[PDB]
Amino acid sequence: CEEGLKRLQQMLAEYQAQSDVPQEVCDQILEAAKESSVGEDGVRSQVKIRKPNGKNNIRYEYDLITFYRHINYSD
C-alpha cells in the first residue's frame, strides 16, 4: 500500500524533477523502455550521466548503513 505520510524529504525529490509522475508509475514506463536504454554493461562510465537521464541544470548543488561501505551481496 501507499497510505504513508509524505515528509518534506519525499516531496523535495519529486518537486525538483521533470517527470511529474509518481514513483510507482514512473518505475514502470522506464522499465518497458529497454529498446534504447540498454548500454555497455560491466564498466563504469566517467560521464556521471546514465541513459535514462536527461534534462539537468547547470547550477552546482552540494546539499547534505551510512559509515561503512555497502557489500555487493547481502541477505
Binding site: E2, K6, R7, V21, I29
Partner: protein, 964 residues
C-alpha cells in the same frame, strides 16, 4: 501478510503497529494491537503494548517478552547464558543482533542493544513502573501515570511540553493518541474487547468485522469508508485466500508449523518453497523453468545459494560474525574483517581498493581512509552531535541552537546557511548567506492544519498542492496559474491526467497491478503485454512492435523490431551477471574483452581497436588509441585527473587545478590559460581566457539577464514567469517570442492541432500517424524522410541528394554514406572519441567529468576550444595564439562561421551538425536548430517531460545530453 492492513494472513489475528514519537536521534516508540490473547492488561488497555516490555517468568527458562511476542536454539538462534547467580544477567542475544538484560529481584530491563550504535536505557520507580527512557546517555523521554497504572503523559525530559496524551475512559480502554505531530485518532471496541472501527485523523474510517467468537476469531470484511479497499478473506484451515476491490484473489497455502509452501496469484503465477523439516529453506521454485537450491552447513549460515543454469554467491563467516567473503558470479573477491566489539576493520573492494577505518575511545567512527585519497574525517564533541565532517577537504562545520536540531552549516568558501524550525520538527525555512551583506536562494515552506505541505515558495515561483484528505496529490497548481488534477480509481491507482488545456492522459492496469496501456494526448494507444514473470515481451505500439525475448536468465539478448518491413535484427551475448562483450548487427559488430579482475581493456568496434590500461587501484592510465596513438594520465591527491601527457615530442602536456570546493578552476598547457570564478552558490559568473573576458549578471529570479563579452558584446535577455524566452537583444536586434506556458508558440503564424505545430514562418510540416514529421515544405524546398521501426531516420532526400545512415546494435551513428564522401565515427561509450573523413584520424578530448569539449588532435597538431558557461564551442585557437575558428549563436544556435580553416562539427553538447540536412544529432534524435524543438517523440511517453518535443525551458541555463 500485509495485504491492505498489517493483519496476518496465516491466522485471523488483527495486528497493527502505530508510531507515537519519531525523533531525529533514532528513538522509535511503536505500539501494536495483537488482537489474539489480548485479555491481558499491561498498563495501556486490553491488548496494547509499547515494545518495551521484556519480562521473565522465572530466572532463565527460555522466557522473554516484547510488543510482538547457554541453551542455544536451532529454530530461533537464541542463546541466553548465565553470568552471575547473585544478580541475574540473562543476555538473550537473539539471532537478529538483539540484546536484553533482565535483572532478578528488581525486574528491570537493561542494555537493549539493537546493533552497534543503537542503545537504550530505562529507569523505573520503587514499583514496577518505568519513568525515564534515555537513548544513550541523555534523558529523551519521561513518562507519568494517573495513580492507576496507566501512562497519560510522555515528555522529552528536557523542556516542559505535552507530546503524547493517552486519553482513557470508564471501560478500561484508550480512545486518543495525540502524537507529537498533533494528529489524534479515535477508536471503537466491541463487548468482547475487540476493535471494530478505526477513525483516521484525516477523516478516513476503517470498519473491522469478525466471524468467530472469543479471542480466536477471523478478521474478515475489512472495508474502507467509500468502498475504497473492499478486502475479502476466506480461510479453509491451513489455506487462506484474500481478494481486493478489483477481483484479485490470491491464495496462500500454509502448514501445521506456519510456513509458506504455495502462493497462487489470480493471473496464474505459482511459487513453491521446500524445507527439510529443520526450519530452513532448501529449494525455491519460480513460475518459470528455474529453481534455486540452498545449501547450509554447521550452524546454518546459508553457505551456498546456487541458482540453476548459473553460479553461486558462496557466503562466508569466520566463526560467528557477519559477511566477510562474497564470491560474486563474475569471480571477484571482496574480503572483510571484524573484531570482538564490532568496529569494522580493513576490507578489500572488488578490483584493488582497500578501506581502513579508525575509531576513537568511544564507539563512533573517526577516520575512513581509502586508496589514492577519498578520506573522510568526523569530529565529535562531548555530546553525541556531529561537529565537523570532511569528505575531500571541505571541512563543513555544523552549528546547533542549544537543541537537537541543526541551525547552521558553514562552508570553506564563505557561504553560511541558516535553518528556521518551529515548535515541532518539519523544518520551515532555509536561507543562504555569504561573507558580504547580501542574500540569495531563500526558500520558504508551509503546512496546513495537518502534517502535509501546502505551498513551496521558490525564487522562481510559488507552487501549491491540494490533497483529497488521503495524501495522494490530487491537484498541483503552478506559479503561472495553470493547474493539473489527478484522478484515482479503486485501490488508489492513477487513471487520468487532465491538464488545464483540455487534453488528458490515461492509464490502464491489468489484474496484476501493472501499467498496460497508455493513451497519449494526440490519441495514441499502447498495450504493454507482460510475460508470466513480470517483463515486457510485446510493446505493441499503434504501428510498430518490438517482440522482446530473453535467455531464461533475466537479460535481454534479441530485439526483433519491425512494422512490416525494415527488420532490425539485434542480438546480445549477456553472460551470467552482465558483461555482454558482444553486440552484433547487420552493419557493425562490437566486441569487448575483460581482464581477470573486471577491467575493460578492449573496445573493438568493427575493424578498429581501442585500448586502455589500469593501475593497482583501478585508475585508468595510458590509453592507447588506434593509428599508433597513446596518451598518459596522471592523478593527484583525492583521486582527480591532474595531468594529460601525449606520446609525441611536439605535444605539450595539459594541466588543471581545483579549488577548495572541489571544482575545476584553472587549466593550461603551455600558453592557453582558462580560469573560472564562482560566487558561492555554484554558478559561473566570470571567465577569463588570458586575452578574453566573459561576465554574467543574473536577475532577481536566478536567471541569466545580461552577458558581457569583451569583444564588443553586451547582450540582454528577459524571460517570463515560467522562464521561456520572451525578449532577447544581442546589440540592437530585439526579438519577440511568446508561448502558451506549455512549450508551444502562441504567435499568429502557427496552428497546433493537439500538441504539435503544423506551420512556422511559412514552412509547413507534415506529421504521420506515429508522431514524427516526414515532410517539410519551406521556400520551394521539399525534404522527404523515411524512418525505421526504432523511430530513427535512415534516409532523407528531396534536395537532389541521397544519404544513408548506418547505425549499430545500440543506436549510435556509425556510417554516413553521402555525396561528398565517407565519414566514420568512433565513440567512447557515450562521448565521441574520434572521427575519420578519409583524410586523417581526428580525435577529441573533453573535460574529465563533463561533456564540454577541450581540445582536438589532428595532423600531429592540437587545437583548443573556448567554451562559454553553457558548454558550446564558439571559438577554436591553436598553440600559437591566433584565432582559427569562430562562430556565434543568437537565440538557438546557427552556423555563423566567419573564418573556416578546419572542419568544426562540434555543437552544444555531444551534437553533430549536418551539412546536407541542417539538423543536430545528440545521441539518438534529430534536433532542428531553426525551430527550437525536435522532430520526433522521445521513447519515454510521460516520465520524461510534459511535452514530447520540447528541448528545454530556455536554451540559456539548461542542457540535454544523451539525446533524451
Amino acid at each position: 501478510e500485509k495485504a491492505g492492513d498489517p493483519v496476518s494472513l496465516v491466522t485471523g489475528e488483527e495486528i497493527l503497529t502505530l508510531n507515537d514519537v519519531e525523533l531525529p536521534n533514532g528513538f522509535v516508540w511503536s505500539r501494536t494491537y495483537r488482537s489474539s490473547k489480548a485479555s491481558r492488561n499491561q498498563g495501556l488497555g486490553y491488548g496494547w503494548r509499547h515494545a518495551f516490555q521484556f519480562e521473565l517468568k522465572e530466572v532463565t527458562d527460555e522466557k522473554h517478552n516484547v510488543t510482538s511476542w547457554t541453551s542455544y536454539q536451532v529454530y530461533v538462534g537464541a542463546s541466553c547464558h548465565f553470568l552471575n547467580p547473585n544478580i541475574r544477567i540473562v543476555t538473550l542475544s537473539s539471532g537478529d543482533q538483539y540484546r536484553f538484560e533482565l535483572v532478578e529481584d528488581i525486574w528491570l530491563l537493561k542494555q537493549v542493544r539493537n546493533g552497534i550504535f543503537s542503545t537504550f536505557q530505562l529507569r523505573y520507580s520503587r514499583n514496577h513502573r518505568l519513568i525515564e527512557v534515555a537513548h544513550n546517555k541523555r534523558p529523551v523521554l519521561e513518562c507519568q501515570y494517573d495513580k492507576q497504572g496507566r501512562l497519560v503523559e510522555l515528555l522529552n525530559a528536557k523542556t516542559e511540553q505535552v507530546l503524547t496524551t493517552y486519553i482513557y475512559d470508564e471501560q478500561d480502554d484508550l480512545v486518543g493518541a495525540t502524537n507529537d505531530l498533533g494528529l489524534t485518532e479515535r477508536y471503537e471496541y466491541q463487548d468482547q474487547h475487540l476493535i471494530a472501527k478505526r477513525v483516521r485523523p484525516t477523516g478516513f474510517t476503517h470498519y473491522f468485522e469478525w466471524s468467530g467468537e472469543g479471542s480466536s476469531a477471523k478478521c474478515i470484511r475489512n472495508f474502507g469508508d467509500s468502498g475504497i479497499y473492499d478486502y475479502r478473506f476466506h480461510y479453509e484451515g491451513a489455506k487462506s485466500s484474500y481478494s481486493d476491490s478489483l477481483d484479485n484473489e490470491w491464495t496462500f497455502i500454509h502448514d501445521e508449523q506456519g510456513h509458506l509452501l504455495e502462493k497462487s496469484s489470480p493471473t496464474g503465477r505459482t511459487w513453491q518453497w521446500h524445507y527439510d523439516h529443520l526450519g530452513r529453506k532448501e529449494k525455491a521454485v519460480f513460475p518459470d523453468n528455474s529453481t534455486t537450491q540452498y545449501q547450509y552447513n554447521q550452524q546454518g549460515q546459508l553457505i551456498s545459494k546456487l541458482h540453476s543454469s548459473g553460479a553461486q554467491i558462496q557466503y562466508g563467516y569466520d566463526s560467528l560474525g557477519k559477511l566477510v567473503k562474497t564470491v560474486s558470479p563474475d569471480g571477484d573477491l571482496e574480503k572483510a574483517y571484524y573484531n570482538s566489539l564490532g568496529q569494522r576493520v580493513w576490507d578489500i573492494d572488488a578490483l584493488g581498493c582497500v578501506t581502513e577505518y579508525e575509531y576513537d575511545k568511544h564507539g563512533q567512527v573517526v577516520k575512513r581512509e581509502s586508496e589514492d585519497g577519498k578520506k573522510s574525517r568526523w569530529w565529535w564533541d562531548k555530546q553525541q552531535r556531529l561537529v565537523a565532517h570532511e569528505v575531500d577537504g571541505t571541512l563543513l562545520r555544523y552549528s546547533y541552537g542549544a537543541t537537537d536540531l541543526v541551525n547552521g552549516i558553514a562552508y570553506p568558501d564563505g557561504c553560511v546557511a541558516q535553518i528556521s524550525y518551529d515548535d515541532y520538527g518539519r523544518r520551515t525555512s532555509i536561507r543562504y548567506f555569504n561573507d558580504e551583506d547580501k542574500v540569495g536562494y531563500s526558500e520558504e515552506y508551509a503546512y496546513d492544519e495537518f502534517s502535509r505541505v501546502a505551498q513551496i515558495q521558490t525564487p522562481e515561483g510559488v507552487t501549491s498542492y491540494q490533497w483529497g484528505a488521503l495524501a495522494q496529490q490530487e491537484a498541483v497548481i503552478f506559479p503561472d496559474g495553470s493547474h493539473i488534477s489527478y484522478e484515482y480509481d479503486q485501490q488508489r491507482n492513477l487513471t487520468k491526467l487532465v491538464r488545464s488545456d483540455g487534453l488528458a492522459f490515461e492509464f490502464w492496469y491489468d489484474s496484476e497491478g501493472l501499467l498496460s496501456g497508455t493513451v497519449g494526448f494526440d490519441g495514441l494507444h499502447s498495450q504493454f503485454k507482460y510475460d508470466s514473470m513480470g517483463r515486457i515481451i510485446r510493446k505493441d505500439v499503434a504501428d510498430r512492435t518490438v517482440l522482446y525475448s530473453y535467455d531464461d536468465a533475466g537479460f535481454l539478448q534479441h530485439i526483433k523490431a519491425g512494422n512490416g518491413k525494415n527488420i532490425v535484427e539485434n542480438h546480445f551475448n549477456y553472460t551470467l551477471g552482465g558483461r555482454l562483450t558482444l553486440a552484433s548487427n547487420r552493419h557493425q559488430t562490437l566486441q569487448y574483452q575483460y581482464s581477470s579482475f573486471g577491467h575493460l581493456t578492449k573496445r573493438i568496434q568493427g575493424q578498429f581497436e581501442i585500448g586502455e590500461e589500469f593501475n593497482r587501484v583501478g585508475q585508468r592510465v595510458s590509453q592507447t588509441l588506434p593509428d599508433k596513438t597513446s596518451f598518459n594520465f596522471s592523478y593527484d591527491t583525492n583521486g582527480r585527473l591532474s595531468e594529460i601527457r601525449f606520446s609525441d615530442d611536439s605535444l605539450p602536456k595539459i594541466e588543471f587545478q581545483y579549488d577548495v570546493m572541489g571544482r575545476l578552476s584553472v587549466t593550461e598547457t603551455e600558453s592557453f590559460r582558462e580560469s573560472k570564478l564562482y560566487d558561492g552558490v555554484g554558478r559561473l559568473v566570470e571567465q577569463q581566457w588570458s586575452g578574453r573576458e566573459k561576465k554574467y549578471i543574473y536577475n532577481a529570479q536566478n536567471r541569466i539577464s545580461s552577458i558581457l563579452d569583451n569583444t564588443a558584446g553586451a547582450t540582454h535577455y528577459q524571460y517570463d514567469t515560467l522562464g521561456y524566452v520572451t525578449k532577447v537583444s544581442e546589440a540592437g536586434s530585439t526579438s519577440t517570442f511568446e508561448s502558451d506556458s506549455f512549450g508551444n508558440p502562441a504567435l499568429a503564424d502557427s496552428k497546433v492541432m493537439s500538441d504539435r505545430i503544423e506551420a512556422y514562418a511559412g514552412v509547413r510540416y507534415k506529421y504521420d500517424q506515429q508522431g514524427n514529421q516526414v515532410k517539410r515544405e519551406g521556400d520551394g524546398t521539399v525534404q522527404k524522410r523515411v524512418f525505421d521501426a526504432l523511430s530513427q531516420l535512415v534516409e532523407v532526400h528531396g534536395d537532389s541528394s541521397i544519404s544513408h545512415y548506418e547505425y549499430d546494435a545500440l543506436g549510435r551513428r556509425t556510417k554516413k554514406i553521402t555525396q561528398n564522401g565517407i565519414t566514420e565515427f568512433l565513440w567512447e561509450g557515450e562521448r565521441l572519441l574520434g572521427e575519420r573523413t578519409a583524410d586523417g584520424f581526428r580525435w577529441y578530448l573533453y573535460q574529465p567529468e563533463t561533456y564540454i569539449p577541450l581540445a582536438v588532435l589532428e595532423n600531429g597538431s592540437i587545437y583548443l576550444y573556448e567554451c562559454d558557461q553553457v558548454g558550446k564551442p564558439e571559438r577554436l585557437k591553436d598553440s600559437a595564439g591566433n584565432i582559427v575558428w569562430s562562430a556565434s549563436y543568437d537565440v538557438h544556435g546557427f552556423a555563423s562561421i566567419d573564418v573556416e580553416e578546419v572542419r568544426n562539427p562540434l555543437r552544444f553538447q555531444g551534437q553533430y551538425f549536418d551539412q546536407e540536412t541542417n539538423l543536430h544529432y545528440n545521441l539518438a534524435r534529430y534536433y532542428d536548430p531553426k525551430l527550437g524543438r525536435f522532430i520526433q517523440q522521445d521513447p519515454i511517453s510521460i516520465a520524461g517531460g510534459i511535452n514530447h518535443y520540447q528541448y528545454a525551458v530556455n536554451p540559456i541555463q539548461w542542457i540535454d545530453p544523451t539525446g533524451f
